[PDB]
């Protein structure tokens, strides 16, 4: 199931939040930059494409 749990951490001025999303074995991330995410992983492991096959 989806589990919905969050944190935030106000550091000099820095509000900063993760979003952790724990379903189907994926834990999205979604840390707040100055109250804007700028980073999305999946259980700490960033996932775009893979354009070389190997």
Same mark, same amino acid.
């Given at each position: 199931?989806?589990?919905?749990?969050?944190?935030?951490?106000?550091?000099?001025?820095?509000?900063?939040?993760? %979003?952790?999303?724990?379903? /189907? $074995?994926? +834990?999205?991330?979604?840390?707040?930059?100055?109250?804007?995410? %700028?980073?999305?992983?999946? /259980? $700490?492991? +960033?996932?775009?494409?893979?354009?070389?096959?190997?």
């Amino acid at each position: 199931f989806k589990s919905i749990s969050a944190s935030t951490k106000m550091v000099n001025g820095r509000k900063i939040t993760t %979003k952790r999303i724990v379903e /189907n $074995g994926q +834990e999205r991330v979604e840390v707040e930059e100055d109250g804007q995410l %700028k980073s999305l992983t999946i /259980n $700490g492991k +960033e996932q775009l494409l893979r354009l070389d096959n190997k």
